[PDB]
Structure 1
Amino acid sequence: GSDNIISFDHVTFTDSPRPALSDLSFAIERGSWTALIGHNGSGKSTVSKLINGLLAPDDLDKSSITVDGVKLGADTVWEVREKVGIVFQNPDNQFVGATVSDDVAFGLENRAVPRPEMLKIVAQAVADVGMADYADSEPSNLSGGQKQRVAIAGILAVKPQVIILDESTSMLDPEGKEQILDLVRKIKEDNNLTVISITHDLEEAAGADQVLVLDDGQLLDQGKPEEIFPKVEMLKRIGLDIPFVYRLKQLLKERGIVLPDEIDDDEKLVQSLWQLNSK
């Protein structure tokens, strides 16, 4: 059930000899947290903006982007922005409204939702995240995590089908990143929407439903997190560390305690250690 399917894409950045993306091809399954990890120069920074039309591939004839059967183009770029909502990297910049209840309402204003239904939807979306008490707090009185929560609420209020956490937790402390990920997982379960993760935070790709790896503008490898992460040697030559569980597995392998490669969660590893403990 592919939702986003970028097929044979090319972006040149108007300026640079080497194109950012070269013949990228993948498909995002509906209702699956798909993490998309890569290096900074790999070109993953523009996947989010390409998905909802803010950037166009160089050859529209060769390069086709489909979002819920709506082939992205100069005309249909606005219907695609009614399905795909993106949470950008810097929380301060994307926070447009002068209060929390106004940043959330900025999406609904643009669609000409009547004010009473606007109030109902804004209250529901602000209370959906843990921001019910800060409905009047100003942009500068909020933390980095709180502004990301308000951004997620504003993306949520317009009822999207894809939430693209485009490096959303890049500038947050590790306690804030965990809170944001718990919130996004709960939202994805409740609203039954696809979540795409363009991040270099490997622990967030460790819990995804599908992992896409990019080198220099091309899809290197894909599959479940249980397959991409154990092959640490591939991730070494492209400049990417592996999550804590897999790194500890490799350290134990170097020490001498070999472990099977399907161990992906923390509890699985501690139980597998316990079975070896009894011996």
Structure 2
Amino acid sequence: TEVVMENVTAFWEEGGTPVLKDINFKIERGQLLAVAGSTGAGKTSLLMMIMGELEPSEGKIKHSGRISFCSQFSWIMPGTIKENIIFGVSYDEYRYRSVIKACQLEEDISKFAEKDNIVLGEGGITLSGGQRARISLARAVYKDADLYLLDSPFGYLDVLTEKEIFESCVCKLMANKTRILVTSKMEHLKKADKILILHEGSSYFYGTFSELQNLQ
């Protein structure tokens, strides 16, 4: 699917300050939009609008079909690591294994005696912050959808691991998928088809990394 926002303004609380102000962008089918900005700038709120949780007061929004959402807060439910990634979707060995590999979870899983059947969220193993984040990412990426909304999914990862998973998962495995990635890392912005930088709800910059470079 493509995604369009045109002159979008929105409020979480009627009669308050707007959380998003005159936002404009367009993603073609299969492109990657990177959304940057400081804390509170409105990045997650932008994703909430696409998911229908926040309604616009002005402007137009276009997008169509199933959404897969990866929250910036990683989470696990009681069940195996395989169950947490599949999370109710039909199982396919090749699809599952390719997601695991792209999220670098094969190394972790290979070290468990129960492999993919290690049980999480029941007081047995307590996973690291980075393991929980990669599992949450793998869960969102395994789901088949027309639009993937990945809200700062690389929590607790070191910068090289983050870079490698951005490349293996977001850029290679998901190459033909329409993606919105909330991220502030320079290499991610460099590889994105478009970049949207938010500041206090407003569009600080919108365009390509090359266009931002030319302003220097």
Structure 2 match to 1:149: 134
Once the two structures are superposed, residues 32-86 of structure 1 have per-residue CA deviations (whole angstroms, 9 ceiling, x without a partner) of: 22212222232122111211123223x3xx4432213xxxxxxxxxxx4xx2212
**Aligned twin of 2:62:** 66
2:3 aligns with 4
The 3 A distance-change label for structure 1 pair 96 and 6 is farther
Give CA deviations for 1:7-30 in whole Å, capped at 9, x if unaligned.
Answer: 232332228832111121211122
Tell me the distance in 1 between the aligned counterparts of 2:130 and 2:178. Answer: 22
> What does residue 218 of structure 1 align with?
202
After superposition, the Cα gap between the structure-2 partners of 1:148 and 1:126, relative to the gap in structure 1 and judged at 3 Å, is farther
SS at match of 2:72: coil
1:89: which partner in 2? 72
Aligned to 2:158: 173
Instruction: Measure, in 2, the Cα distance between the counterparts of 1:173 and 1:102.
Output: 26
CA shift in 2, pair 1:125/1:95, >3 Å: farther
Q: Is the 8 A contact 1:107 1:154 kept in 2?
A: no
Alignment match, 2:189: 205
Q: Which 5+ residue runs of structure 2 have no aligned equivalent?
A: 110-114
Tell me if 1:104 matches 2:85. yes
Distance 1:204 1:214, change over 3 A: same
Q: Secondary structure at the match of 2:52?
A: coil
For residue 87 of structure 2, give the secondary structure of its aligned residue in structure 1. Answer: helix
Per-residue CA deviations over 1:68-116 (Å, capped at 9, x if unaligned) read 3xxxxxxxxxxx4xx221222122xx323422112123242xxxxxxxx
Distance 1:151 1:9 in 2: 29
RMSD of equivalent CA atoms: 2.5
Show the counterpart of 1:188. Answer: 174
Q: Measure, in 2, the Cα distance between the counterparts of 1:201 and 1:24.
A: 21
- Evaluate the alpha carbon distance shift between residue 38 and residue 65 of structure 1 in structure 2; reply closer, same or farther with a 3 A threshold: same
TM-score (norm 1): 0.63
Closer, same or farther in 2 for the Cα pair 1:170/1:152, shift >3 Å? Answer: closer
Larger Rg: 1
> Structure 2 length as normaliser, TM-score?
0.79
How much has 1:218 moved relative to structure 2?
Answer: 2.3
Higher helix share: 1
User: Amino acid of the residue matched to residue 124 of structure 1?
Assistant: Y
Q: Distance in 2 between matches of 1:53 and 1:188?
A: 24
Distance 1:63 1:87, change over 3 A: same
Question: Which structure has more strand as a fraction of its residues?
Answer: 2
Q: Which runs of 5+ in 1 are unaligned?
A: 69-79, 109-117, 233-279
Q: 1:141, CA displacement in angstroms?
A: 4.2
- How many residue pairs are counted as aligned between the two chains? 200
Counterpart of 2:97? 127
Q: Classify the secondary structure of the residue corresponding to 1:127.
A: helix
Structure-2 change in CA distance of 1:55 and 1:96 (3 Å): farther
Letter in 1 for 2:77: V
